[PDB]
Structure formats: C-alpha cells, structure tokens
Design a protein around this nucleic acid. Structure first.
Lengths: 63, 53, 167, 100, 145, 143, 103, 141, 82
RNA sequence: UUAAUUGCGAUAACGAACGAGACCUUAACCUACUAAAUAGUGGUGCUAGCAUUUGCUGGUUAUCCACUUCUUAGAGGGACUAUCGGUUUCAAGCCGAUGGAAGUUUGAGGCAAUAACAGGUCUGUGAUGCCCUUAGACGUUCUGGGCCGCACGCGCGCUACACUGACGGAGCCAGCGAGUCUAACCUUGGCCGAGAGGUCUUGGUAAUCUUGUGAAACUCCGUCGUGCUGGGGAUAGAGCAUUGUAAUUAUUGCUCUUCAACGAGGAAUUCCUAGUAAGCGCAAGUCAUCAGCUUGCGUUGAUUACGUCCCUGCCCUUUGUACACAC
C-alpha cells in the first residue's frame, strides 16, 4: 500500500503551487526544503510530503 | 469476650484486602498497591498508569 | 529506605486517595485538579479550583483541617504539609468541574436536555474545538436509554485523544 | 562531603531539564564531575483482564509504568550543597541525596 | 574383550525366590524383573556383590549366585548402611525389614487389612476401590470398573 | 612455548588425566561412592561403578580452574539438569551437594584449590602447576 | 562407501526420478466431488520427491534397529536406481497410476 | 600505540566482539583456539571466512573474539560474522582498499548475511495464544 | 474395564544375546565379502543382538582386519580394507 | 489500485466531521555527537601457572590514564518503494536488480466512528429504583466440614505410545521480571547427608547482590536394543523435614518401589507466512504451601503458500420479497 492520504495529496498540490522554484528533483534537498517551509509535527509525515513532492517533480520534468 | 476473633488471619486472603473497595478476592498484591483489579482499571487513567501496547 | 518502585506506587495511590477525597467532598466547592510538589521535608499540593472563595472558609479553617488531617495521619510537623488554592482562567477547561456542576444540577431537578445543552453552550463560549456530553440511564422511562449532544469535531482515537482531550 | 544526588522520576522532560540545568550549574560554578550516569529504563508490566466478571473473550491488557534513573556524585562544600538543595529545585522529579 | 565359554552347567530354566525367572539377560535387570526389586536396588546390590556389569545372569558361578541371594535376603551381613530397605518401621515389629516376591503382597495384605479392621479412611477407600491419594475422581480414572 | 588447558581437546585430555590420576592413587578416597546417583533429579545410577570419582574430581578441578570462584551451589546448578517429574513437565534440578562438597574438600586436601574471599575457592599455585604439568605429560605420552 | 559414485549425483538423480511428474487435483463440480489430472511444476516435483523420500525414511526407521541415517541412505540408493519396492518410487508410480486412470 | 581494530558479529541474542591486530597469526575464541568448540560442523561453519580468505596473508596478524549471549548456533554465527568484519576492517585501515573492496565482494558472493545482520528479529507473543500468531484453540461445545 | 485392543503376538525372533564358539566362528566366517559394515547390518544378517554386534565389532577392530573411518556415537559407519 | 468513501477520477453536487489513515511504545542501522571504579578495551609493580624463550587467564578499589567497539538516555539522522526496467484513459498503482536495515505501511500493539445485543456483571464497593431480615434476621464472628465429592458425557491441557532413542559422564548460552522498616523476601557461606533437611552476619532498596540465572532440549564418548521392555510414568505401601499451633480425602520435596492404559487414534475439527508453526525452557500473577494454567521473554528452528470464492464468514452494488422482535 504505497498510496498517500488526502492530507499528503493536498499538501503536495498546495505547497507545489506556490513553492515550485525553491525545490527541485533532488530528494534530499526536497526533504530539507519542505521541512523548513512547512510546520510538520511528524518526521514520517514530512518524509511522506517530501517523497510526493519528488514524485510530482519527476512528473513535471517531462510534459 | 476475648474469643470473638480467636481464629488467625495472618495469611491467605483473610489478611489481603483491597485499599479502595475492601475486596478480598481478586486482590493483586504486586508492588504493594493492594487494590482489586477493576479498581486498578478505573484508577489507572488518573494515577498515571497509561496503556501504550 | 524502602524500594523506589513501591515508593512511587504509594505516591500514586496517595494521589488517587486525595483525588477521590477531593472529588467526593470539594466537588460542590468547584474542585478541578491537583498536583503534588515534592520538596525536602515539605509537601506542597496545589489546587486549581472554581469556587475558591467558598472552598477557602472563613480565615482558612477548612484549609487548616485539610492540612492537619494528612499532617496527623503521617505524623507531619504542622506546616510541612501545605496546600495552595488558585483559580484558573477559562473554567470551561475542566471536564471534572463541568461534570460535578451538572451532577448537582440533576439532584437539583433541572431538565436533562436543557441542562446538558447549557453545559455545552458554556463550554462553546469557553472556546472548545469540540464538546460532547452523553447522559445514559432512565429518562422518564423504565428502560435504560443513552443519548448524546455534541458540537465541533471530537477525535475518538490516538495519542491526540491521549493528550489533547479532557474526559 | 562525598554525597550522591540521584533522580528517580517518571517525568522524562522534567528529568531531562533538571539534569541539564544541574549540569550547567556545576560546570558554570567549576565543580569537577563525571557525567550523569544513566540507568536502563525500568518497565513495570501489570497484566489485567478487562472484564470485572468472568465473561467475554479471554482478552487482556498490560498496564505499563516507566522509570528513568540518573545519578551524579558530588564532592562539594557544605554551604554550596545547602545552596543547591535550596535553589535550582525543579518539581516533578523525585530527587534525593545520600552520602557515599 | 573377555570371552568365557559356558559349559553344560548352564540350565535353560532357573528357579529362585519361588518364581520362574529368565536368564540370558543382564544380571542387574534379571534382578529387576524379580518382584519387589527395581533398577537402583539391583544395581547397588550388584555393586556390593562385585560382579561385572557387562556380564549376563546366565554366565555366573554358584558362589556368585549364592552371594547375590545372600545380599538380597540379608544386607546387614554385607555391611549395608541399613536404610536401603523397602519396608522399614512396620507395625508388627517397628524396625527395618526387607521384602521379596511373596513378601510384598503378604505385607500389603497385612497392613491394608489392619486399615480395614480399624475402619480407617484409607482402609475404607481401599475396600471401596477408590482413589486413596486424594485424587480427583469426577472425570479422570473411569476405566477401573 | 606454553600450553594452557583452554587450548587442548576437552574429552581426551580429561580421560588421560583421569587415567594418570587413577594410576597415581594417593587421594584418600572416602568410600561412600557407588551409592549415590550424583543428583537428586537423576533416576538411575551412573554406569562405571568402579570409577567416575576421579572423573568428577578432574571435572570440578578443570571447571574451577577456568572460572575464578564458584561454589557448591554453582557446581550443583551446572552438573544438574531436569528430572522427568512424571506427567508434569521438566524443570531444572540441582546435582548432588554432598558429593560436590566432598570433592571440594578432597581437592582442598590435595591442595589443587584453596578457600577464597567473597565465598568460594580459587586455584592454588601448586594446583595450577601440577594440573598443567600433567596436561603436558598427557600431550607427551598420548602419541 | 557403497556405490562409490558421486553421492550428490546419486541423490540428485534420486530426487529427479522420484519427482511426481503428474498427479491430480480435487474438483467440486456439483453433486459429487471428482478428480482431474494435471501436470506439476518442477518446484513441486522436487519438493514432493524429497518429501516422499523423507516420509518413507521416517516410516522405515520407525520402530526398528535400523538407524534413520542408514535407512535414509538405502532409501536414496533405491530411489536413484529403481527397484519397485522403495517407498518413494512405490508412491510415485501409485500417484502416476491414479492420475492416468483418473484422467 | 598498537594498531588494533575492534568489530563485532551479531545474531538473535549473540554478540561476539573481535579484536584484530598485528600478532603471531592465531585465531582464539573465548580464550580458546577456534578449533575447539567441538560441534564438528559449526567448527567448519566458523572456519568458512578463514577457509575462504586463506590464512597465509595474515602470518603475524591475530584475532581475539570473545562471545556472549544466545545459543550455540547464534554464537558461532556471530563468531563468523565478527571474524569476517574485523578482517575487513584491518584490510581497510592497514592494507590497500583495492584488496579490501574485492575481499568484501568475495564475502558478499559467499553469503550476504556474513556482513549484513539478519533482519529476523524476535516476534512478541500476543495475549490469547501460546505463540505470536498461534491462538490457543477454538471449541464449539 | 475393556482391553479394547488386538494385541496380536510378535514373531518371537531368534536374536542371539549370549555368544558361544559356534556363533563366534560363524560371524567371523560370515563377515567377509560384505562391502558395508554396521551394527544394523550385523543384526539383520547374523540375527544377533546389539550387545553381541558391538562386542564383536570392537574385538575385530582390536585384532585388525578392517580400518574404520568414523566412530561417531549412535551412527557407526565401517568398510572393509581389501 | 490499495488493507481501507485509501486515492485517481467521473459527476446535482459543493463544502465539512468521525472512523481509517495519521498518532504513540517495542524490535531492527550508526564503529558518528554528549555520558559509564555499579564492566571492559588497551600499558605497569603484586602477579601464579603453562613455565625458563619473545604468548593466554583472572583478582590486587583513592593503585597511575583515553574511550564505550560489548549494560545505556537524548534535537538524534534514516526506507519516503531510493535509483532503474516492464503493464495501466500509461494518472493513481502493481511485478522485478542492489550497496542501504528491513522495499508485504520495516514489523508487533494501544487507542479505535455511528447505532445495537435485552450478551456478562447487583458475588467490586456506605450506589441505587422495586420486593427480603429487623430481632430464635440473610447483620459481624467461633469449631468442624463442603466447593477435591463419582456410575457417566464433554473443553484449552502436561507426559506419552521409543532408537532423531531411554539412561550415564564430561563442554557452554541470554532475555522479559521480582525481591526485607517498624516487617523479615530473594537467599551469596563454612558445615553435618542418598536426597529433601538443619546455623550469624557478611549482599541488596536494588547496571552494584540474589543472577555469567553455568535453564532445557543441545555437542563427545558410554549401557540396552525391539521384549509393552532399561519405553510410558501411575496405581498401591515404607520412610526422611522447612508450610501452616492445625495434611487428613497422599498439600508438598527426595529414596526405594509399582511396571498399570498407551504400539501415532474413527467420524470430526484449532494455529500458521516469518526467526514465525512447533519443540524446549525461564521470570512474574495469584505465593503461608502447592502450576501440568495464564501474562511475557529467550534457545533450537522447517518444507510448505503469493491463489481462490468451492465450504464457512465480511463489505458494496443490483435485484426479488406476502419479512420488519426482521429466514
């Protein structure tokens, strides 16, 4: 079950909508940018958000 | 009379009683807390016995 | 002197005993909570309560009796045990206090529905994200019925329940 | 005079900040010592049936208590140990001092 | 790797203690198969008699069988610590006695009969044919009728 | 070179040392041997009636030589085991304290061991030297 | 020590030969539970071969002076060669027959 | 000081701590030569790293492994994993990394578990059964 | 109260427990030609007991005919030197 | 597609909440950051032994040092399918190669929505509505018993029905857990003994002591060898003493004995996808005494499976209904 919850869905959509230039395809840098531009009360939730943002950037890099 | 309580109660559940509801059966003696099991269930939340697993 | 495990277990059982005593009698005096301050040769116990001015008694007599009870019980020298009484803002942040309030309201004879609604409205003014009051038992009936009122969102599971809620 | 201060509480954050501020006080007041010796967390497990009666499925629950223990040895003067006992006292942590 | 030839002095059957016993097997267990004597007792009496444990009861000499029966019927002759006996401090005498094939059943009969004639609880239980060690008889042990 | 006991094969060394000890034969044997079962949990006497005592003595000497200070209780716990307690399951049962203590006293008298602080026995210097010398003798006469 | 050829070769040959090449599965259908023949994967072939092997070994070693080690050795020798008496092949041919006949 | 490397091998409950350094070229376990655990099969099992790397290149390099915890199998597995890890550490800190990388490649090809500990940790037992996933029974009448 | 069993008797074999000269020489003359030597094979081919089989094996290996390869307990594997 | 009204998405729905998920404890990586005379790693005098020749074991506690690689607490960091190859309006996802710790949420749990059962519970209580005793009471107690009674049927269970053995002697292992202040627990010691038994403090308010818990199966060499027999331990009797002022309808622990059904069991049914089924045990619970029980932990440790709706169950949709305390 690698699916993500709706809170991860909406966090990814919203934070990418107005944070596209600051983050990139790099996973670790995505983690270290989302953690500081977000107030997440869970390391695991932060890791989820960063992983989905990397997936979205891999989607964006083509098409 | 002086033979009202001749029979001893120095062992067994004659001695062990709960400190809350005066229970004799079901008395968990461990750690010297001397309360019955259902009283322990009720008062764990307030004493600070917290369920994690 | 004695083992630390048994020592802190007795600490817990004494805390339970004092909480039971307080909720049994100081309830109608608006009792809400207690916390034990341990100091060398001193036992400070704090009480945040709603009806402080009437729990105090005329010139501290009731506070003196509460103190000297446990004083003589554990052969304390007078003054070593000390209990302090304060009043906390936002009295709606006390589930036990609200519980005893509508508990007395029932023995007064107020309607269950209106009384519980008034309690939940007092809480909503206090500023709760969610409140929930269940009354269960006989409601002008010979069969036990359970009924509830709620407002806001009330999480039912998790350590958010373990910490953020009051029951 | 060759005393030992130990902390046997269950409030983990209060114990942590107590140890931190005691360490800071000792270092800032220039008293040589070794670090706070930390003992294994003692877990007390007490298993109880949920049901007051004998009915229901044979379900169980385990109430758990946690204990953290710390200790530090001090060789410090009488007036300074009086000062430490009377000040920098933080509630919630059961702290006791013995000698040797 | 010792080897001894058995001459015609061997008998296909041997009659000792008023009961038929089979040879050809180890000496210790040829004693165990006797009534009233078991593993430990047979082993220790063989040790007192100083007989080779690997040897079988068939290939034994006359003085060896005589010393075996001597230690069986009288340990006090061969300086035994005297508490090894099977039935000690009995009712009839109150001292240490030794039991054999007929003797076990004879003395069991005697003391159980004493129990019945004094109408003791254990004796009445033996008369009824029920458990005498305080066991649970409601569900377990129905295959005795 | 220097060869310690923890370097040699246990079984054959113990057997050769026991044979040498038996041929030596100046240990003032008690005599109550060939009666006990070496444990309270055993149900059947050991097999070698004429021996096994030098075996037990050499074993306890080796065990105490490798350890630092163990007592009669430790020896009983180590040499013991479970007893078939009828249809009840098995539980550890300690070995024979009387024989363990008497081999302790016999090893004391022959001087391999000595009483120790904290309770128990330690290895005497002469005990070390003679046990290891006879180990060397076994290594020199085994072939 | 017996049949001094490669021991791993003879045991792998025994496994390959004893492997049940065809068996049958139960099919409900309706009204009556019937049986239908299928062929089997090599995983299950080798697993069933060694399973029948060790089952026959345990049976032949149960309640006899013959030890499990050498009873297993003789069972492998018979399984590698083929003598119509070994447990493993005597059940292999039985299952092949009850699969072909059920077919 | 003396150049000495300290590593460990682990299993279920067996921890074996190995000290490798420049010595006379002997392998000793719990104060004993590694030849005398006497299981006759676990002996070769703990020989496996040595038989695989060859003992010739460590003529004056000795290893002292002290083991604790766990049963015999877990202990010998910790022994082999520790005598491999210490060897690799020595070949990294004192011999060419060219040899170290190929040696650890050979260890991986021989078996992955010799450098990476088993992720098969004990499974807690739940109430309502004798085992972690085994329930007591279930009767109807 | 019921026996509740068939309890059919056994074969009453002739396993030999004591050893005389006519069995000593017989086993001595019958052990040759046998490629594989073991206690089980001795029992099954000479109808002899375990004690006699082990005693005879150790006597023969003391005299020196076949050199063994393994003396492991509960499993003895032997072969003949030819 | 997922384990999931998990989501993607379509769309008279849009916007919200609970449950789920998130959440917290436990186990698994760091040879890296702060800390361990409640232990060692590495060096010397006391060192003794193997021994004389260049190595191993330990003790010597105001006897001199760096650290935690082995007993540990923490902003701790890290698996988010990370990288890549295949299928999918190629969207969410699924199957494969790996350093990396695991790539079935990395596992195992706690809490767990709305509604309900007339399911358990007045035997947990100075909690109660309604009936009972109010004085030869059902109110508190004393001496005996009883719940252990046995013709019989059932329900988790422990030992089994022998050679992978039974028994005998030698070599070693950790963990969950408990332990005495106005009372006496866990027991480290010398001793008298087949064993069980019998003494004063040294040890302990417990990383120091009990406890390297030296536990069990387990490794080497030994006896018996297929006889219900050295297998199986129970039904009888004889003894030795800590428990209880009191064992007796054996309380219990040892020695002798007894040698009984049991030769893997019909129909019929319980647990199971990894350190897990199972086999061995250990600590605690009720403990004056008594585990074959339970709550957890540890040792040895397998082939099996990666599918199904066929039997038994769950949810959703459609559908029929003369049902609606509801087949």
């Amino acid at each position: 079950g690698r699916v993500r919850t709706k809170t991860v869905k909406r966090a990814s959509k919203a934070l990418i909508e107005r944070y596209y230039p600051k983050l990139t395809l790099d996973f670790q840098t995505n983690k270290r940018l989302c953690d500081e531009i977000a107030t997440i009360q869970s390391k695991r939730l932060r890791n989820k958000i960063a992983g989905y943002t990397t997936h979205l950037m891999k989607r964006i890099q083509k098409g | 009379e002086n033979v009202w309580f001749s029979h001893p109660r120095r062992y067994g559940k004659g001695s062990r009683q709960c400190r809350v509801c005066s229970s004799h059966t079901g008395l968990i003696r461990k750690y010297g807390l001397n309360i019955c099991r259902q009283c322990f269930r009720e008062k764990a939340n307030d004493i600070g016995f917290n369920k994690f697993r | 002197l004695i083992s630390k495990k048994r020592k802190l277990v007795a600490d817990g059982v004494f805390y339970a005993e004092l909480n039971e005593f307080f909720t049994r009698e100081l309830a109608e005096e608006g009792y809400s909570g207690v916390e034990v301050r341990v100091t060398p040769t001193k036992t400070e116990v704090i009480i945040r309560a709603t009806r402080t001015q009437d729990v105090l008694g005329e010139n501290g007599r009731r506070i003196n009796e509460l103190t000297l009870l446990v004083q003589k019980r554990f052969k304390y020298a007078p003054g070593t045990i000390v209990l302090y009484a304060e009043r906390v803002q936002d009295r709606g942040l006390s589930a036990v206090a609200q519980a005893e309030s509508m508990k007395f309201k029932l023995l007064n004879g107020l309607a269950i529905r209106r009384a519980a609604y008034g309690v939940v409205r007092y809480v909503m003014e206090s500023g709760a994200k969610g409140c929930e009051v269940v009354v269960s038992g006989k409601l002008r009936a010979a069969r036990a019925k359970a009924m509830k009122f709620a407002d806001g969102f009330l999480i039912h599971s998790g350590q958010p329940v373990n910490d953020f809620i009051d029951t | 005079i060759k005393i030992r201060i130990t902390l046997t509480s269950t409030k983990v954050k209060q114990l942590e900040n107590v140890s931190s501020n005691i360490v800071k006080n000792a270092e800032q007041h220039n008293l040589v010592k070794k670090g706070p010796v930390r003992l294994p967390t003692k877990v007390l497990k007490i298993s109880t049936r949920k049901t007051p009666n004998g009915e229901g499925s044979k379900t169980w629950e385990t109430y758990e208590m946690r204990i953290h223990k710390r200790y530090i040895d001090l060789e410090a003067p009488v007036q300074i140990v009086k000062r430490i006992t009377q000040i920098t006292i933080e509630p919630g942590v059961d702290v006791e001092v013995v000698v040797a | 790797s010792l080897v001894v030839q058995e001459q015609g002095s061997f008998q296909h059957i041997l009659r000792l203690l008023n009961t038929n016993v089979d040879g050809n097997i180890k000496i210790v267990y040829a004693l165990t198969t006797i009534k009233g004597v078991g593993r430990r007792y047979s082993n220790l009496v063989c040790k007192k008699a100083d007989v080779d444990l690997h040897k079988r009861a068939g290939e034994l000499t006359q003085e060896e069988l005589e010393r075996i029966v001597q230690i069986m019927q009288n340990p006090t002759h061969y300086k035994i610590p005297a508490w090894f006996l099977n039935r000690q401090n009995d009712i009839t005498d109150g001292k240490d006695y030794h039991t054999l094939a007929n003797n076990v059943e004879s003395k069991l009969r005697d003391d159980l009969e004493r129990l019945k004639k004094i109408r003791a609880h254990r004796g009445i239980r033996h008369f009824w044919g029920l458990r005498v060690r305080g066991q649970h008889t409601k569900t377990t042990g129905r295959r005795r009728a | 070179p220097g060869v310690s006991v923890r370097d040699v094969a246990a079984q054959d060394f113990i057997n050769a040392y026991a044979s040498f000890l038996q041929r030596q034969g100046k240990l003032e044997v008690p005599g109550y041997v060939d009666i006990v079962k070496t444990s309270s949990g055993n149900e059947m006497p050991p097999q070698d009636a004429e021996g096994w005592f030098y075996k037990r003595a050499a074993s306890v000497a080796r065990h105490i030589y490798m350890r630092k200070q163990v007592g009669v209780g430790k020896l009983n716990k180590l040499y013991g085991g479970a007893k078939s307690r009828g249809v009840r399951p098995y539980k550890h049962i300690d070995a024979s304290g009387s024989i363990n203590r008497k081999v302790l006293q016999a090893l004391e008298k022959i001087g391999i061991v000595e009483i120790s602080p904290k309770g128990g026995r330690r290895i005497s210097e002469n005990g070390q030297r003679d046990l290891d010398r006879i180990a060397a003798q076994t290594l020199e006469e085994d072939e | 020590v017996l049949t001094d050829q490669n021991p791993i070769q003879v045991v792998v040959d025994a496994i390959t030969n004893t492997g049940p090449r065809e068996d049958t599965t139960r099919v409900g259908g309706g009204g009556a539970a019937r049986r239908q023949a299928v062929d089997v994967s090599p995983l299950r072939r080798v697993n069933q071969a060694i399973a029948l092997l060790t089952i026959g070994a345990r049976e032949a070693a149960f309640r006899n002076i013959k030890t499990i080690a050498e009873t297993l050795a003789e069972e492998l020798i018979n399984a590698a060669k083929g003598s119509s008496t070994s447990y493993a092949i005597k059940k292999k041919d039985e299952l092949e027959r009850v699969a072909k006949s059920n077919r | 000081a003396v150049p000495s490397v300290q590593t460990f091998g682990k299993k279920k409950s067996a921890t074996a701590v190995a000290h490798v350094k420049a010595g006379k070229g002997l392998i000793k376990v719990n104060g004993s030569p590694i030849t005398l655990v006497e299981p006759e099969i676990l002996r070769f099992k703990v020989y496996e790293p040595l038989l695989l790397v060859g003992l010739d290149k460590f003529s004056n390099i000795d290893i002292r492994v002290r083991v604790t915890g766990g049963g015999h199998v877990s202990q010998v597995y910790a022994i082999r994993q520790a005598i491999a890890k210490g060897l690799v550490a020595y070949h990294q800190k004192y011999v060419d990394e060219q040899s170290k990388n190929e040696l650890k490649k050979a260890f991986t090809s021989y078996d992955r578990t010799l450098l990476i500990a088993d992720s098969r940790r004990p499974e807690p037992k739940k109430f309502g059964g004798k085992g972690a996933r085994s329930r007591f029974q279930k009767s109807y009448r | 109260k019921k026996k509740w069993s068939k309890k059919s008797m056994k074969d009453r074999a002739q396993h030999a427990v004591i050893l005389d000269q006519e069995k000593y020489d017989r086993i001595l003359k019958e052990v040759p030609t046998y490629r594989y030597v073991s206690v089980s094979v001795l029992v099954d081919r000479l109808k002899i007991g375990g004690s006699l089989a082990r005693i005879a094996l150790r006597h023969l290996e003391k005299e020196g005919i076949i050199k063994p390869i393994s003396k492991h307990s509960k499993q003895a594997i032997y072969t003949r030197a030819t």
